[PDB]
Write a structure and sequence with these properties.
The structure is cut from a larger assembly and holds chains A, B and C. Chain A is built from 25 helices and no strands. By secondary structure, chain A is an all-alpha fold. The longest helix of chain A has 17 residues, at 356-372. Chain B folds into four domains: 1-336, no CATH class; 371-477, no CATH class; 478-571, no CATH class; 572-764, no CATH class. Helices cover 24% and strands 33% of the residues of chain B. Chain C has four helices and no strands. Chain C has helices at 2-32, 36-82, 89-102, 106-114. The chains are: A mainly alpha, B alpha+beta, C mainly alpha. Chains in contact: A-B, A-C, B-C. The PDB classes it as protein transport.
Chain lengths: 475, 764, 116
């Protein structure tokens, strides 16, 4: 009923708008009521709130021009820097496609700055890569020295400045003043200062605060932050040890186990990533990350029925996407559940909300067509994958294969060149171009293409045979 | 049906209502003594509704009373002094009211009535937010209640008597309040993320027993006491789930990856653990033993309060209530339904309609293999041109744009017509003038319009484009001047008619030996030969000959057609220059090579600057002092060199552009002379104009020489040459910057001479 | 206050260093497309940021050397207090002063340096 009471109830219920508006009203009506002020702050900052553990974002500057790793040639297995590319598709040369996109996945690192600007903006990130990673209250006006004396206002105002205004400098100033006031004996302000430092790029001054907070109160968030720091310094084994210490404190925490699995899967050790994802399953059994990762892995290691079980589980728990339904249609067609494939593909096409998702669904429908044995429907599906996303190297490769099957060698050559220019990390257009070049002579381009094939997927046997043939011809 | 909240007695509970936590309650408010439960629901309007579901129907609603003021909290307990019978306490902002739901039977199941009799009421001098109840202290057979005002004040009422009220210390917003009996303590979650436990006697005597800095603020707090083996205080934070010991520290905690709304720890099944139940804002319930997820099921609505009760001979029924009004009893669905397409026989495929459409579309497919007029008018006088564009349908998203030349400039470049209704006319007017020094390669101009035709397949319409050309007057970039006599470069065009008076063709340039000066300084001379039928054009620059030579020819044609004569040629006996042409090609290529060298120099300077800047950065990161003036005085030098090289690259780009514009006119004239010299048809002239005049300016991946050389090699290879060794060794088409213009010049001379030897141009 | 000033200066210099790395990337981009106006503007901004950061470095190192002087003064004072007493009281006074400064109990520090 009353203004403040109803604003509180709205905020509790995650309205975040009715309480904000009613707070504007109650503030204009009575210029002296700080409860409504901090409540409007909370509503504002929680409309936009995002988990800081998951906000790991890396720009080109932080990839190339920010050096913080101690070693330079660490032993293989002690730094972050399965199905072969002949089975599991790849996003870059290494790091085949995953089952779960978090906003911190890397899937490689661009070498130079030229290598990074001249590459599709979502090749090493889960969002377009950057160069670096009226109003409510005016930040310059309010004096943090006054708010930091009272923590009830201090914590909410800090959350507002750090998560809404995104001004890490004023946030760190308020956090420093507030930690001064509280005589350095509350873990929360330590963790907030650590987050501010980690944003500013000072990973050791942030590790210091996370460590000083763990000594005060062992909480899941501090372990996740500290492992995030230890991974920013490129020390995966320190992070694994910290995670295991956390799991010693919290005997079954799913976030720690999933962090361990993410590390083991970024070190490209799927044998332990899958074991820790299986532990997460033994704990959660609705975990989207664990189920998607084990499901993809099962699909690609000659077990589409088990992957179908896992994705059907994701569908039972109320997930309704374009990716989920594409995956379901694929696992159905390959598990030989021919009665549930094409309806899942149509549902996926319905749910698609991009032009890359539509292109991927038409690409997979073209694969279903190729399997069914009709190259005309396959032709149309690959061409529609191109219509929906012109930079779809796989559609070009498969369409060129079908063309070369028809007899159109020049069409196939141009399409394979476009593909191998769009995705240089893909061995298939390189190998195809080299093969149909050697078939017609032109051993120069045949060799130039076999070399890039072997650069993309080196243990490929046919590429080795072709390279040896061409090197014999050269001598 | 697996992992879905299978429905039971359920009903929507009003007309745009509003409920919160503490509204939904579930107990034996009727005091039947049997053991079933009755769903009690207050509202933020006043509708106190009590139901007894009997699975909706109409016997369910025991009563639907409407009190005036909103109902913040509803609770059921021994709220009356003498009797030990459960009563119903209802909390409004400024009122506490304890009723007594007494039901008296009728001879028929729809004749029994229920009345809520006000057993007492307390006025609140403060605006409440919630309340809790328990046996404050160790008193038995009583449930006396503590109400938390919204301004942080615990007003404790022992039933029927306002006991006292203590201001909670250091609180701005109000938080969730709970009461522990194993420790006789109130427990709050204040605004500074501090879970605080106060002892009841310390409050009655007035401080804080203990505190715990959880990382957030709490929605709900449930001190569950069905089990006495070990008391534990559960806390639902706005991001985390906690279970805390009785001394204060964390017994365990889970980091929810969702936004919880309500939670309820119901009875436990194992030894020591406690099953708990948490609802998402993703409308899903999670069953968690300790922190382990034991089940998860999809709710219909985002619950605002969940309970678990025994309703009509069924234990453990889940009772959810939203803030819209969806009240629902439910159980958990445990049927892993098979995944199989339905085997329906009625529903079959209407092959006839579908096949008609498929034949239609396949017809369009097999057919694909086998409406706006634009006109530009140039005024005869910075000349003002007007473009008139007209339609015949209702075109949409129309855009008109004009492209003249690099030197020439327009005052208006783009015109946007969002929609023009059918058979209508639009007319734009712009003005073009020379800006620069050199003369443009052609006084032509192009106006291109792009629109969308609304169709049946696509309501945004197919995109279509149509263009028109206009021809600017020579007197825009020229004026008459003093005719020189002996110039360096000259070319003679011979005609088969009588030599015409120059004052006829150029009447604004007055004299039967004429002279032209262009804006910029270039000067050309036109000599009408008096004994021969020819004319001669001369100038010190081979490029400036093209504009006058073009206008001579064009206006000769126009004059002889106006008169009425038909027979007319411009034979141009002699030899195509090919020597004052190659000088411009060599100049252009020298500028290109200079630009590439400067770009490499700038690459090196930028790499060096980056290295030094990174050194300085690492120096800035270190806490300890360190002398560095050497480093910043290296940086300043490298930066001034970078600025120098950038300005030099800009200068070379401009010089290269001017060289390209002069070369365009040179090659225009050369194609004209080759067409007059071998009597080339219009198509054979268009092939030359496409091979020799490729692009508008040089770019860092495509330039002029590469393109023209590839095109000439292809034409020589598939039109003129016969031997294959030559077709494979000399005649090679590549598209990278060359090392020298030797091949381009070899191919241009070979092209000229093999045209002279009878060869003619084709395409395939 | 030396601690606080150093913290604020390090924060500001981290901000400006991130800015400078972003500008390095942006300048490399503008130079890869031979866009010289924007490249020269990035280089101007880099020059200005380097000037400001060098001023910040000077002031930070000055305050930092003053901080080292203060820390040495404190430690040498604890040592001068301990060195005044022979035997087992020495490390007693030393650890007592260390605990009285880790808790910022300055008055107890001077009490234990006077008689304790």
């Amino acid at each position: 009923m009353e203004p403040l009471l109803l604003a509180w109830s709205y905020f509790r219920r995650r309205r975040f708008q009715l309480c904000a508006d009613l707070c504007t009203q109650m503030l204009e009506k009575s210029p002296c009521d700080q409860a409504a002020w901090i409540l409007k702050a909370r509503a504002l900052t929680e409309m936009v709130y995002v988990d800081e553990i998951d906000v790991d974002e890396e720009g080109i500057a932080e990839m190339i021009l920010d050096e913080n790793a101690i070693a330079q040639v660490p032993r293989p297995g002690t730094s972050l820097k399965g199905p072969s590319p002949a089975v599991r598709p790849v996003t870059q040369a290494g790091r085949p496609i995953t089952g779960f996109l978090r906003p911190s996945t890397q899937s490689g690192r661009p070498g130079t700055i030229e290598q990074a600007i001249k590459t599709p903006r979502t090749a090493y990130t889960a969002r377009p890569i950057a160069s670096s990673s009226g109003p409510f209250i005016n930040l310059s006006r309010l004096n943090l020295a006054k708010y930091a004396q009272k923590p009830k206002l201090a914590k909410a105002l800090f959350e507002y400045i750090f998560h809404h205004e995104n001004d890490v400098k004023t946030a760190l100033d308020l956090a420093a003043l507030s930690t001064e006031h509280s005589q350095y004996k509350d873990w929360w302000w330590k963790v907030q200062i650590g987050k501010c430092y980690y944003r500013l790029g000072l990973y050791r001054e942030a590790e210091k605060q996370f460590k000083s907070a763990l000594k005060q109160q062992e909480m899941v968030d501090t372990f996740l932050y500290l492992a995030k720091v230890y991974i920013s310094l490129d020390q995966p084994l320190t992070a694994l040890n910290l995670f295991k210490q956390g799991l010693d404190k919290f005997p079954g925490e799913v976030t720690l186990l999933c962090g361990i699995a993410r590390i083991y899967e970024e070190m490209n050790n799927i044998s332990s990533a899958t074991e820790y994802y299986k532990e997460v399953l033994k704990q959660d059994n609705t975990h989207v990350e664990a189920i998607a990762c084990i499901g993809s892995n099962h699909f690609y290691t000659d077990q589409p029925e088990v992957a179908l079980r896992f994705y059907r589980r994701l569908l039972q728990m109320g997930v309704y996407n374009c990716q989920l339904f594409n995956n379901l249609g694929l696992c159905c067609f390959y598990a030989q559940q021919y009665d549930m494939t094409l309806t899942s593909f149509e549902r996926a096409l319905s749910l698609a909300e991009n032009e890359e998702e539509v292109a991927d669904v038409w690409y997979n429908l073209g694969h279903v067509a190729v399997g069914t044995g009709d190259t005309n429907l396959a032709h149309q599906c690959f061409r529609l994958a191109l219509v929906s996303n012109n930079q779809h190297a796989e559609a070009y490769n498969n369409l060129a294969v079908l063309e070369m099957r028809r007899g159109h060698v020049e069409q196939a050559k141009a399409l394979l060149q476009t593909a191998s220019s769009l995705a240089p990390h893909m061995y298939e257009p390189h190998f195809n171009f080299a093969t149909i070049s050697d078939k017609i002579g032109d051993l120069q381009r045949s060799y130039a293409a076999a070399k890039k094939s072997e650069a993309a997927f080196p243990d490929h046997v046919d590429t080795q045979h072709l390279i040896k043939q061409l090197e014999q011809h050269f001598a | 049906s697996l992992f879905k909240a299978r429905d039971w007695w359920s009903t929507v509970l009003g007309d745009k209502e509003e409920f919160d936590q503490g509204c939904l309650c579930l107990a034996d408010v009727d005091n039947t003594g049997n053991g079933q439960d009755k769903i009690i629901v207050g509202s933020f309007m006043g509708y106190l509704r009590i139901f007894n579901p009997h699975p909706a129907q109409a016997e369910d609603l025991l009563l639907e009373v409407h009190l005036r003021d909103p109902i913040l909290q509803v609770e059921v307990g021994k709220f009356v002094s003498g009797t030990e019978m459960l009563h119903l306490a209802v909390l409004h902002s400024r009122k506490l009211c304890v009723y007594s739901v007494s039901g008296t039977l009728g001879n028929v199941e729809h004749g029994n009535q229920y009345q809520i009799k006000l057993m007492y009421e307390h006025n609140l001098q403060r605006t409440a937010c919630n309340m809790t109840y328990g046996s404050f202290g160790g008193v038995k057979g009583r449930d006396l209640i503590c109400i938390q005002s919204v301004d942080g004040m615990l007003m404790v009422f022992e039933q029927e008597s306002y006991a006292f009220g203590r201001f909670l210390p250091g609180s701005l917003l109000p938080g969730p309040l709970a009461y522990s009996s194993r420790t006789d303590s109130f427990i709050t979650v204040s605004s500074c993320h501090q879970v605080e436990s106060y002892k009841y006697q310390v409050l009655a005597f007035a401080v804080v027993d203990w505190t715990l800095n959880i990382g957030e603020q709490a929605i709900d707090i449930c001190i569950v006491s069905f089990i006495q083996s070990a008391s534990s205080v559960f806390v639902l934070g706005e991001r985390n789930f906690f279970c805390l010991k009785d001394n204060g520290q964390i017994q365990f905690m889970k980091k929810l990856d969702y936004s919880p709304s309500c939670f309820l720890p119901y009875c436990s099944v194992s030894e020591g653990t406690i099953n708990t139940l948490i609802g998402n804002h993703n409308n899903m319930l999670h069953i968690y033993q300790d922190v382990t997820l034991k089940w998860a099921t999809q709710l219909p609505h985002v619950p605002v309060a969940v309970r678990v009760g025994c309703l009509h001979d069924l234990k453990g029924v889940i009772v959810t209530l939203s803030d819209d009004g969806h009240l629902q009893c439910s159980y958990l669905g445990t049927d892993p339904s098979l995944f199989q397409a339905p085997k329906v026989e009625s529903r079959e495929l209407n092959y006839d309609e579908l096949d008609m459409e498929l034949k239609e579309l396949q017809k369009v497919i097999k057919n694909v293999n086998k409406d706006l007029k634009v006109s530009a008018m140039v005024s005869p006088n910075s000349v003002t041109v007007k473009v008139t564009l007209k339609n015949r349908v209702a075109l949409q998203k129309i855009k008109l744009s004009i492209y003249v030349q690099p030197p020439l400039v327009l005052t208006g470049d783009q015109f946007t017509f969002e929609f023009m209704a059918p058979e209508m006319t639009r007319t734009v007017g712009f003005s073009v003038y020379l800006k620069g020094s050199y003369s443009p390669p052609e006084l032509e101009g192009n106006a291109v319009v792009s629109y969308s035709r609304p169709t049946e397949r696509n309501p945004d319409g197919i995109p279509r484009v149509s263009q028109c050309k206009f021809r600017l007057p020579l007197k825009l970039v020229c004026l008459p001047g003093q005719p020189s006599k002996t110039a360096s470069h000259k070319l003679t065009i011979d005609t088969n008619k009588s030599p015409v008076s120059l004052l006829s063709l150029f009447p604004g340039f007055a004299v039967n030996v004429m002279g032209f000066r262009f804006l910029g300084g270039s000067q050309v001379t036109l000599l009408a030969s008096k004994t021969s039928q020819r004319y001669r054009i001369q100038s010190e620059q081979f490029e400036d000959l093209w504009l006058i030579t073009n206008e001579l020819i064009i206006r000769l044609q126009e004059y002889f057609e106006k008169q009425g004569i038909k027979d007319f040629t411009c034979s141009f006996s002699g030899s195509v220059p090919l020597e004052e042409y190659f000088e411009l090609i060599d100049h252009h290529f020298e500028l290109r090579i200079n630009g590439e060298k400067l770009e490499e120099l700038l690459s090196e300077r930028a790499v060096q600057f980056r290295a030094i800047q990174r050194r300085l950065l690492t120096r800035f990161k270190d806490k300890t002092p360190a002398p560095l003036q050497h480093l910043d005085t290296l940086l300043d030098g490298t930066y001034k060199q970078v600025i120098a090289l950038a300005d030099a690259v800009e200068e070379n780009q401009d010089n290269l552009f001017q060289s390209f514009t002069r070369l365009k006119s040179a090659t225009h004239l050369v194609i004209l002379l080759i067409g007059l010299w071998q009597k080339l048809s219009a198509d054979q002239i268009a092939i030359l104009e496409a091979a020799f005049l490729p692009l508008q300016q040089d770019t860092q991946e495509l330039g002029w020489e590469e393109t023209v050389d590839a095109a000439l090699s292809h034409l020589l290879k598939t039109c003129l040459s016969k031997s294959s060794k030559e077709q494979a060794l000399n005649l090679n088409s590549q598209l990278g910057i060359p090392k020298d213009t030797s091949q381009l010049k070899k191919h241009i001379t070979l092209f000229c001479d093999r045209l002279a030897k009878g060869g003619r141009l084709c395409l395939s | 206050e030396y601690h606080s000033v150093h913290q604020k200066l390090s924060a500001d210099m981290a901000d400006n260093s991130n800015l400078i790395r972003s500008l390095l990337v942006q300048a490399e981009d503008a130079r890869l497309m031979r866009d010289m106006k924007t490249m020269k503007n990035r280089y101007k901004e880099l020059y200005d940021l380097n000037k400001d950061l060098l001023n910040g470095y000077k002031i930070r190192c000055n305050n930092h050397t003053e901080l080292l002087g203060s820390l040495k003064a404190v430690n040498q004072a604890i040592q001068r207090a301990g060195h005044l007493r022979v035997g087992k009281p020495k490390n007693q006074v030393i650890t007592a002063c260390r605990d009285a400064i880790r808790s910022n109990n300055i008055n107890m520090l001077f009490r234990i340096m006077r008689v304790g």
